[PDB]
Amino acid sequence: MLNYNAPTDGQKSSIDGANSDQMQTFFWLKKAIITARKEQYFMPLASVTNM
Amino acid sequence: SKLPLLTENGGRVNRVGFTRIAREGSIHKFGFFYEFTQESIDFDSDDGLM
């Protein structure tokens, strides 16, 4: 029978021979995870003097 | 030596015969098949494999 088996972990599919292997084995979201800024407390307190 | 000659009198001479032959032929049967699974189609990287 033609089986998918598990192309990852070293068990090639039935359709694939000795030379071939699956091209796509995962899906990629393309939306990354990011971290925002840390809030600041002392900075708004200050006033500015020109020089 | 074996020509079909006649004489003026005639009579029951020079009789011949015929034959027929028969021939024949027959037919036979062939076939083969293959199998697959659902995951073999769903998760394979190439669509249109079937």
Curated annotation (Swiss-Prot), chain B:
Subcellular location: Virion
Function: Assembles, to form an icosahedral capsid with a T=9 symmetry, about 60 nm in diameter, and consisting of 535 capsid proteins.
Protein name: Major capsid protein
Range of the intact protein held here: 102 to 151 of 401
